[PDB]
Structure formats: C-alpha cells, structure tokens
Amino acid sequence: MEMEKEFEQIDKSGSWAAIYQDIRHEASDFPSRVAKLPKNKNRNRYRDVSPFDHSRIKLHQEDNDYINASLIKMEEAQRSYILTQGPLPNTVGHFWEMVWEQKSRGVVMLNRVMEKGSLKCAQYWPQKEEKEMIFEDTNLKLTLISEDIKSYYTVRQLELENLTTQETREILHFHYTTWPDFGVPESPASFLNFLFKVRESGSLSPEHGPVVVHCSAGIGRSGTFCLADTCLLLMDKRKDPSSVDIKKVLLEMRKFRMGLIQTADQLRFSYLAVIEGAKFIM
Numbered sequence: 001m002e003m004e005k006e007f008e009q010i011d012k013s014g015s016w017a018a019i020y021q022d023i024r025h026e027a028s029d030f031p032s033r034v035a036k037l038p039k040n041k042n043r044n045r046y047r048d049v050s051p052f053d054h055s056r057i058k059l060h061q062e063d064n065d066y067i068n069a070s071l072i073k074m075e076e077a078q079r080s081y082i083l084t085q086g087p088l089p090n091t092v093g094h095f096w097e098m099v100w101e102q103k104s105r106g107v108v109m110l111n112r113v114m115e116k117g118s119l120k121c122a123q124y125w126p127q128k129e130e131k132e133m134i135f136e137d138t139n140l141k142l143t144l145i146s147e148d149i150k151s152y153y154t155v156r157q158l159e160l161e162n163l164t165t166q167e168t169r170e171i172l173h174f175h176y177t178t179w180p181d182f183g184v185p186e187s188p189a190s191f192l193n194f195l196f197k198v199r200e201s202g203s204l205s206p207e208h209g210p211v212v213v214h215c216s217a218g219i220g221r222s223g224t225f226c227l228a229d230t231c232l233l234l235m236d237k238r239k240d241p242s243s244v245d246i247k248k249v250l251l252e253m254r255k256f257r258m259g260l261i262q263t264a265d266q267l268r269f270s271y272l273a274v275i276e277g278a279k280f281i282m
C-alpha cells in the first residue's frame with residue numbers, strides 16, 4: 001500500500017502495536033559473540049543491545065578492537081551510517097578513535113546528557129574553548145572551536161588532533177536537544193528541519209566517511225533518524241515514489257543492527273516524518 005493512506009488505515013484501526021510486533025517477529029537474528037566476551041562487559045551500556053559480529057566497527061588496535069557500534073550500509077540509497085551507543089566513561093577515547101579511523105565528518109546526538117534524572121551518556125566533548133580534552137588511552141586531543149545554540153538544536157565545530165601524527169580535522173557536532181523525556185514529538189517539523197541541516201553540512205555525503213549517530217542505546221531515536229533519511233532519498237531516486245515501503249526499509253536496516261525503532265510510537269512517528277518530509281522536498 002501507499003504510505004499516507006496505510007497510515008490513516010492503521011490510525012483508524014488502532015493497530016500500531018500489532019504492526020510493530022510483526023516487525024519484531026520478522027527481524028534478523030545474527031550472532032554477537034564478540035560483544036558478549038567477559039573482557040568487554042564495561043564497554044556495553046545495556047546488556048540486551050549489542051552489535052552483530054558481521055557488521056560491527058573494529059577499532060585499529062591489536063589489544064582490544066571492540067566498540068558497541070554498527071555499520072548500516074544502504075545499497076540502493078547509496079548512504080551509510082554508523083549507529084552507536086552513547087559513550088561511557090571508559091569508552092570516550094574509543095569513540096573518538098572510531099571517528100578518526102572511519103574518516104567521519106559529523107556526529108549526530110539525539111539525547112541530552114541527563115534525562116529522567118539519570119545519566120544517559122558521558123560528557124564527551126569540551127564545553128569551553130579554552131578547556132580542551134585529551135584522551136590519553138587513544139592519543140587524541142579535542143578542542144571546541146565554536147558553538148551555535150538554536151531553539152531546537154545546537155551545532156558545534158570541533159577540532160580533532162591525532163597526537164601521534166599531528167594531523168588535524170574539523171568535526172561537526174549536531175545536537176538535537178528537544179526530544180521529550182517520554183514519548184515522541186507531537187510534530188515532526190523540528191526533527192525534519194534538523195535532518196536537513198545535517199544534510200546541508202556535507203556530513204552524509206560520499207566524499208566523507210559515514211556519519212556517526214547515537215542516542216543512549218543507539219537503536220531508538222537513532223533508528224528514526226536514518227530510517228527517515230533513507231526513505232526520503234529513495235522517494236527522490238525512484239520513478240514511482242509510492243513504491244517506497246517503510247516497513248521493508250526498516251527490516252533491511254535491522255539486518256545490520258538489532259532493535260532499530262524501540263516502540264510503536266516511534267514507528268508511527270517515523271511514518272509521520274517521511275509523509276510530511278515528502279511534501280516539503282517538492
């Protein structure tokens with residue numbers, strides 16, 4: 001079926017939970033043996049969210065190459081994404097090592113450091129220009145260059161230096177700051193505006209490594225971001241845009257990381273975002 005009228009048909013019939021459970025039943029199951037090794041317990045935030053072995057990102061290190069991060073490669077859309085958990089106190093150096101090694105331009109953050117009165121990720125970037133951060137375990141230096149605070153999101157320019165080689169690179173930090181503590185946003189308008197700002201920066205384009213996108217677990221809000229982006233690109237590329245099937249795209253993405261889209265409300269919100277976004281594109 002088309003999207004916008006499939007949407008009204010699920011609303012009128014109140015069957016979002018049943019649609020979402022079908023997706024959960026059909027989703028891929030692949031091994032995640034490296035994630036579950038005892039030496040990696042303090043590298044995982046949640047025991048039930050792990051990268052698959054076949055798609056995990058490897059650190060360029062011989063001691064321990066493990067990080068909780070996955071490469072989502074979308075062949076028809078010609079887009080790739082790295083989805084990862086919010087960094088932990090003992091993985092902030094690994095996080096920036098990955099950004100460096102994978103040649104990423106942008107980092108997309110969809111959570112606040114504290115939500116619901118608890119810490120959802122480490123404070124992994126510097127908050128003042130004159131107070132830079134040094135990660136001794138991976139030999140990187142990170143400096144805040146500039147910060148632009150807007151009503152729904154903040155953009156930061158950061159400088160990452162590889163202290164071994166003295167090479168430097170400019171990284172863009174895109175921080176969506178207004179996702180509610182509970183539920184999903186009422187309108188997709190600010191989320192779509194944010195997606196378009198990430199696109200306009202070059203951070204999603206083939207001349208750079210994959211964008212790094214995270215929330216707390218790296219599957220819910222993060223899944224919504226890449227699902228909406230890929231569906232909109234396919235609608236632009238194809239002769240028949242109504243042939244794009246958001247459930248089939250989501251199942252394709254779940255071949256590369258488990259659990260993408262965590263609730264039926266996030267699934268409904270993803271439909272809403274693609275529907276509204278397809279009208280603005282033209």
Ligand SMILES: CS(=O)(=O)N1C[C@H](O)[C@H]2C[C@@H]1CC[C@H]2O
Nearest residue numbers: 010013014015016017018264265
């Ligand atoms: C009722 S439903 O399955 O169609 N679905 C929508 C409804 O508004 C409730 C409960 C469920 C999931 C999200 C929430 O908004």
